[PDB]
Ligand binder design. Sequence first.
Ligand code: ICS
Ligand code: CLF
Ligand code: CLF
Ligand SMILES: [Fe+3]
Ligand SMILES: [Fe+3]
Lengths: 522, 522, 477, 477
Amino acid sequence: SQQVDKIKASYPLFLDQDYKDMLAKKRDGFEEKYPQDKIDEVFQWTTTKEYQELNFQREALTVNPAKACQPLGAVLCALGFEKTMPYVHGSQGCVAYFRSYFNRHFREPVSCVSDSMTEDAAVFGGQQNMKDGLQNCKATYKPDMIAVSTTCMAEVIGDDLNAFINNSKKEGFIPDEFPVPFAHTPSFVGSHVTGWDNMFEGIARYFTLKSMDDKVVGSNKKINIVPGFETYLGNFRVIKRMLSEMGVGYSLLSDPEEVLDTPADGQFRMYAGGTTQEEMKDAPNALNTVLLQPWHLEKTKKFVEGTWKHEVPKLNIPMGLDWTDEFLMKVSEISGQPIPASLTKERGRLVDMMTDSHTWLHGKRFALWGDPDFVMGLVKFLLELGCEPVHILCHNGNKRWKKAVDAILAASPYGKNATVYIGKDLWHLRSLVFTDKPDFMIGNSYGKFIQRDTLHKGKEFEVPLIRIGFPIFDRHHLHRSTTLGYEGAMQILTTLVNSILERLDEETRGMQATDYNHDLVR
Amino acid sequence: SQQVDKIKASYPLFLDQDYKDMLAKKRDGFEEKYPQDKIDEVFQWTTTKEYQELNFQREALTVNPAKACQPLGAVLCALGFEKTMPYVHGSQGCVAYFRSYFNRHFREPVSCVSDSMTEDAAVFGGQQNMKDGLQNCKATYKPDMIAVSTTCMAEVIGDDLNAFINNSKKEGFIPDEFPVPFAHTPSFVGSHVTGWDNMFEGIARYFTLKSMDDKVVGSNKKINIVPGFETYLGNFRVIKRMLSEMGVGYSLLSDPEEVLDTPADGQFRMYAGGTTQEEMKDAPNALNTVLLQPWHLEKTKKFVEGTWKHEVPKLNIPMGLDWTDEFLMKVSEISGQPIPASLTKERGRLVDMMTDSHTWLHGKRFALWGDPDFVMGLVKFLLELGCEPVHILCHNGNKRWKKAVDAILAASPYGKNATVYIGKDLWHLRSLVFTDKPDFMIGNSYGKFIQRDTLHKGKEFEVPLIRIGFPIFDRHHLHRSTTLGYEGAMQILTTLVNSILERLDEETRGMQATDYNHDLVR
Amino acid sequence: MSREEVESLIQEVLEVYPEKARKDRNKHLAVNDPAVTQSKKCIISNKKSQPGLMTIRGCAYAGSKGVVWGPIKDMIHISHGPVGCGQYSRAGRRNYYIGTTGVNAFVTMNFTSDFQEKDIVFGGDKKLAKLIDEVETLFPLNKGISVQSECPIGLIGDDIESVSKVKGAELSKTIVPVRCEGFRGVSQSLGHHIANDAVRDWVLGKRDEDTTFASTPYDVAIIGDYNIGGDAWSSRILLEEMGLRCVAQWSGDGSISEIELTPKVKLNLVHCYRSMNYISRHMEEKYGIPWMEYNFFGPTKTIESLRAIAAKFDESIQKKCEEVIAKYKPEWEAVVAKYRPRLEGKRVMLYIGGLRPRHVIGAYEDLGMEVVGTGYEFAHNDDYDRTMKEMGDSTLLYDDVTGYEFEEFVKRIKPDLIGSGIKEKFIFQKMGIPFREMHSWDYSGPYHGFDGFAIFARDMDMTLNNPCWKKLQAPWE
Amino acid sequence: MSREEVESLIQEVLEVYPEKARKDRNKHLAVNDPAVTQSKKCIISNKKSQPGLMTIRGCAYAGSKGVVWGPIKDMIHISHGPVGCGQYSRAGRRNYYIGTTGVNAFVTMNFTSDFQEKDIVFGGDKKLAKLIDEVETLFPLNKGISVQSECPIGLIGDDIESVSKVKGAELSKTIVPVRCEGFRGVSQSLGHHIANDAVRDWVLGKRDEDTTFASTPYDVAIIGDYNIGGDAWSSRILLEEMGLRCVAQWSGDGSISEIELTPKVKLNLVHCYRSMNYISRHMEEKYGIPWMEYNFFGPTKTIESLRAIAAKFDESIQKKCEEVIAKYKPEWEAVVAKYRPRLEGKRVMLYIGGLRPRHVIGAYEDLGMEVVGTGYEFAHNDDYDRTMKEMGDSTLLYDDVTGYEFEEFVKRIKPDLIGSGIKEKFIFQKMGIPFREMHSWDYSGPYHGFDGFAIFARDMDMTLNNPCWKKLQAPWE
Ligand code: ICS
Ligand code: CLF
Ligand code: CLF
Ligand SMILES: [Fe+3]
Ligand SMILES: [Fe+3]
């Protein structure tokens, strides 16, 4: 039943008495559901340490992973170039999932095409699909460059990208001079950031491998900036703003910020901004190249050092005070441009907010997850705050990254109770936060279920979620935020301190029970 | 009892069994407390419509007001000028309260001095206090200008600021050339924004009343900007950035953004930035003058039109979509500078976020309070969102402003269930939100108590608080936010939509009871 | 109505493509004539998509894991292969259920085998067995395991049928292998077919020899309703207000015991023909269970469906049906009175998957809304046979439309409202045209039944009459 | 000792001021000599502030309304006058209480008369009577009304004493007029005096003829503890563990019945001498109740205070005192063992209005912290007489210090930690020196008692050893 003046959606419509009676009859009659006492017993068992010991002995099953496959990162890298179509050689369901997943995160149109390989290609390959797809895409969507990645289908069948594209060009399906870079992105190797790295290395190799003869290092007085897999527009904005305030010439390679933030003014822009082909062709003439996320840009680093002969600096991600300082000092050294007074003022303001919020931030315990560079930057920042990371988990991390994070933790007394986990999933983390309860989690939307589980154990056992990372599905416009630089550190500190204050207000809102500590001023 | 490894502050230390037994024994023995049933009965009575009818018949008592007194706004206006000391003629307790209150809001040092008038001054007046205080302040803190306001003490005794300052100058206590503007700021008239208006009008009259002979309107090709009482640094910053993007020459009179956001770099800067005396002296040569908050800048408008002969535009506060458009079009018309493409893109992006969050924002019911210009801008923006404000309350508003807000309401179908209240306090609003429950409140930190009361009636009756306005005490660094322009509209939309999503997640977190609607994607 | 203009637009849109793609896509575009009963003479469907034209279709894994098997709450579904698949399909579809997540319900979770290089090189049967043992260890109260294959499973020589048989015999557990590799078929429809075949082969016949379930002459099974936003629930109550008893619902909020009990019902009420007609026909062939289609979108179709369903039974059920009709008449009449005046005469274009494009038109017509163009991602010619008589004259029909084609059609026709998926939503919002998601329902709902009609009307009104759509043009331009 | 270095610093800081201000401020600055027990020969206090030197002092209204009367939870306190006063004083002081806010407790609320021009011109007695009637109407379970005057009340000739008498006789209600106008006195001290006089005149003696209260030889009254962050509670439990019975608690978490019952106790334990010695002496004179001062800041001072208090009763209370000491010894010993190594040898400067700048020293010394300088906003010469024996030789003393003076003192002395109010916090944080608010405890606490010592130690460690303080210098300067 619905009242026309106050219509109810599923919540709280299905909390009506008739619907509850219906659900009770259904469950008791035909679902053959386990008794509630058995369910409670099993849940309580799953919150225990013995269950955790069983859970961490897993070798074959993965529950609730925190990573994606390579072609997603390849598509994200491809979208960062001017009028470039992402072209994924393989099956179409992969492209449908990529498009929907980026649509839910960015809440923006995301363009990508497939060649729709089917059971026929499973024995013949995808030459015909490649030719027809390149011709159709070029004729229909009018792009300047087609950047080709692969699905696991073509990878297993061993489709030869270079041969396919060459045969497409020599038979007239696409013009010979037309830029078609390619990269193999196997989904059973690495993760989405590995796909980003492979795609960028492929594009760079396509544009500069065969024309190094006339290239002189440093002859354009610019700095190449490679961001890596990045789903915050504000990071691109802050890096450009910080470089521009310094008066430093720069080239931002694979810059997708415009195409993911087009205005709603009555027309659809499939392409917007991006890195030009001229910029990519001229990049080897730069003074040097900076990788913002070095721990998933290793193949790109090998190509840039081996071929462009750029002495790539050993820099961490510019997250937090010390690493932003190191990044800016390295830029000042390479370009010869002194650090301006505005940046000094901004750093002082960030320090001021730190000293203002330190009392509330001291000693708080955090579990957290995400991509390796983001995780290590967040851990360094939390150590700079006086906070205590305890469960540091990176599903797509490796052993060298683990060693570096351990070295970072050892340098601070606040990392004494911290453990770093690689290869583990969110179910492992659920066990970790049940058996050693922290104060808050920092992660993507998938953590919300974990919060639910903790709230089911009790209000005193609930671990609140803080949404920093990728993907963020159940909140709006958080992809506009910034985590890099002093501005990123400022927003992260504001978010953390205000989450702590909000939790404190929730805990002390009880009239005549806990509201003695419900202070007006905090 | 305390465990050294896990020390408890007052919450939850006083929830221990021994403390609970102590408190119960104290209450039962000596407090002579009313029985709990009577307390519950009286609270339930206070949540009723009959109690609301009794509450709105009040004529003499004010409970929990939402306004301050004039010298606070006078001090805020004074701090916006370069190396200027706020000097309040009267009693020192007022200065102590002003300093503490601004310190708690801005979390920054705030400088102001008193002349410490006592019963002796209550009998003979405060000439001697004025002379000694001006001499001492000038000799000690070395400011370029001393801006003088008054407390209710000197206002009641009728101290003459002009005569006191003149006698101070002619007797050599301070140099004759030394700028000492003054303004009467009676606390029993108007509110803090009235004090801001009086202080600014006094300063403008001091610097330009006697030198209008050689002034030519529009001869400096600039626009005077008068913001009014403003406690968001982001508003000053966004207005300056937006004017700079258009390539429009401007003068920002009473700009306190620097002195309230100084770096913490090892030294204390009592003064920083501000409007120069030269800028104030040259203001009458501008093309025109814009008041950002016209509804508390009426005396300033009268002075600027009557003396500077500037045709002040009839503009609302640039809040939301339509009013930002009108403000920028008026700026383009007055300066002759076309609106740039970056501003067009930003407006389109705000439109995009609006259409992205419209489904969740539609039909939500809001009760709000604050200063009149901020209130009406927020109301207009809420109409632009498809939202329904119901209780619009402005303690310091007037009747003409109420007619303006009613006219804005009638222009939209979404304001059909809205009522505007002037002269009412937060207890009236507590009754309003009990008897006609809205979805959320928008207001300052004082609203948190109201939320507490609603939560005491039940979880289904709780009205969540949204902290937009002044003062904000129980959260950190929210004074850095922005509410003006497209940027401010974007932040306001993000805050509203994510508060709605956060409440929805809270209501839907119960496992096997409501967690069926606990969606990953929203 | 302007019939000649429609095919002229089709030709001009066709012009851009190369000759092969143009000849292929020409057969998938049509002008509707309600007098035509055989759709094969006007439109072709269920064909491979053209490479590089940015189709909307999914894969067979989406049709099997994400659509049919996923809603089963008390079973654990293992995405067998690399990690991307189950991650992108995790909790993306609002298939609602009641249960304790992680203890007795596993819908919103992502179980996967997460292949690396070594699993591709040497196979993954041993790791599948080890994974099954680990699933048994850490999730004891599940009631069955399904193994949804991804592309490498079929590409390399894995044989999960034998592993499933051995592990099920060893553990006394129902383990269902599903060969739903993404490269099979052309869309999600073959995923539906494979899922139904697996269901008949490994689940349906468990209780064939069991007669302990007490049956009544009023036993029905809701087939092809996946409880999107609670849709199935809003249907079930009405059927139980008519005096019926629903043993099972497929498959939203569904349980394996309900599927096993399905062969004991007296009537199979099929909501989604396209995804469950296979098992409906199999049940009619093997158990003699009659099945009929029904429509619960809008008051008119709901009333007609209820009257037909009651006509399948005795007089008492018919009288209860009339009582239900009379009880719910004022509510939807009030909904129409409040919302019909604000949506009279507006025009809608729909592009949805296999059922809803023709199947929600009646609800729009109940609001005085005209559907001027509709299309399917993966439908068959029989769905179009129903569609043509459901739609009006000279309205546009289109199968497996491309993004370019659909954008051009929207630019020319200029509808007031567009209903499609998440991959079109922001494209057409930035064009200034109101958009409603027709899969997750813009994360609102339910829309089925009388209670869902009010929510449907409210959502359409709130999106189409939104004040945002009058503000996209800057006042200075 | 560097006593000459300190006097020279005093002179150089003195140099800036004009002659009159320099001559006055010279008497308020001093070098500590613990052998001197007559502070008047060394320092002057309780005088008017020099105009325009940015003093820290408040007003008499703050001393009466904000300090003494405000904590009384079951009474309603009306800020009589314009709106600013009670608004700026609302819920700024963490005086904790148990109650139902708005029903039986009214501490965090702002009741005011909110004068306009007409009230100033014609007076506000009629408005006061009407306000009292409205307060009775909308807050029936209140147990008394206080009327705190602001500056215009005394400047316009309002007679609230007669109105209070008439309305109290009419309504059978206790109405207390308090002439605490901000321009009386020089600071909050006269506010304390006026509030104590009002309490004596209108509240204390109501139950002088009432003998129904059953008394015990173990009856004490906690006077001058305002339950800052629960401070008073952390004291009371210890007194209850020693075998005492606490009738009343002035005035944090206090009730009017407790104040009325106070004249029946056997001993008055005064924590804040400065704000309540007046009523303590009055009660000794009138009722013969002895009163003694105690200190519960840190284990050493609280052990000494507990032993001294138990010495006032029989041997059973002494045995219970020793039991309490033995019970709490390991906890504060563990606190010392954990935190003393982190804070050995550091130096602190304090500036708090009365009593606390000297009572908190012992806790700092228990943490091995040296207090190298201390001062009061509004203390008297008796407070300095008690002070001078508790600080080190050649340590810095200063009364009603200005912002300039204190900034220069901090620059020259360079302390590791500074404890003062909100108006100094950010000033000295931007200078790179750790700061602790010693009025509100940086919104933490309590600090009184054994349980408060752990929190105090943790807070001092967390602020002084904060990694932020090593990062204010950017690496490129
Ligand atoms: S199953 Fe089918 S695409 Fe019949 S695969 Fe698809 S929850 Fe659609 S038009 Mo998403 S044949 Fe269901 C469908 Fe219809 S996922 Fe849902 S909305 S009624
Ligand atoms: S058509 Fe369908 S969704 Fe595509 S793979 Fe095939 S079953 Fe799966 Fe999962 S892992 Fe990633 S997304 Fe693919 S490329 Fe290898
Ligand atoms: S010394 Fe003390 S605080 Fe000052 S006024 Fe006097 S009692 Fe009060 Fe309230 S209203 Fe404002 S702040 Fe004053 S100027 Fe008139
Ligand atoms: Fe968008
Ligand atoms: Fe600050």
